[PDB]
């Protein structure tokens, strides 16, 4: 009964909010209906956000994900799937942003964010940021220009959070 209890976010637009927070700790506190994972097409949750979310589930997310890939095959870059949220959320929306460190087309970042519009409210990281190699300022731009549903962005590093907020407007 205290689900989606987001607290302390700064409003960027009518529907995009941001906080300097650890997304795993935020998921455990606010009990969101949906937490977004920064996934790859094989749902191999090794590093960055995906490795942290999987570790918090004691590898249950990876076991479920490997079964999903055995049944369905890999996702597309820009695509997503809904799986269990385990101890983090009702659901995990695994979204595949382009990985610039693999030379993937940054133009697929808009298609990746469009997955968010299928959910009324989400706790999310910035897609294609961090270990995926895209400029986080650009990822925030594409997020605010694409997502229309209510998205709560968790940015771990205070210094990156300050750069994103300070430069947004
Ligand atoms: O080699 C990698 O980068 C990892 C290791 C496990 C397989 C995975 C992978 C293979 C091919 C394409 C990929 N795109 N995002 C991940 C990915």
UniProtKB/Swiss-Prot annotation:
Residue intervals of the Macro domain: 3-169
Subunit structure: May form homohexamers. Interacts with N protein.
Gene expressing this chain: rep
Membrane topology note: Multi-pass membrane protein
Stated name of the protein: Papain-like protease nsp3
Role according to the record: Responsible for the cleavages located at the N-terminus of the replicase polyprotein. Participates together with nsp4 in the assembly of virally-induced cytoplasmic double-membrane vesicles necessary for viral replication. Antagonizes innate immune induction of type I interferon by blocking the phosphorylation, dimerization and subsequent nuclear translocation of host IRF3. Also prevents host NF-kappa-B signaling. In addition, PL-PRO possesses a deubiquitinating/deISGylating activity and processes both 'Lys-48'- and 'Lys-63'-linked polyubiquitin chains from cellular substrates.
Residue numbers of the full-length protein present here: 1025 to 1191 of 7096
Known regulation of activity: Inhibited in vitro by GRL-0617.
Catalysed reactions, semicolon-separated: Thiol-dependent hydrolysis of ester, thioester, amide, peptide and isopeptide bonds formed by the C-terminal Gly of ubiquitin (a 76-residue protein attached to proteins as an intracellular targeting signal)
Compartment list: Host endoplasmic reticulum membrane
Domain of life where this protein originates: Viruses
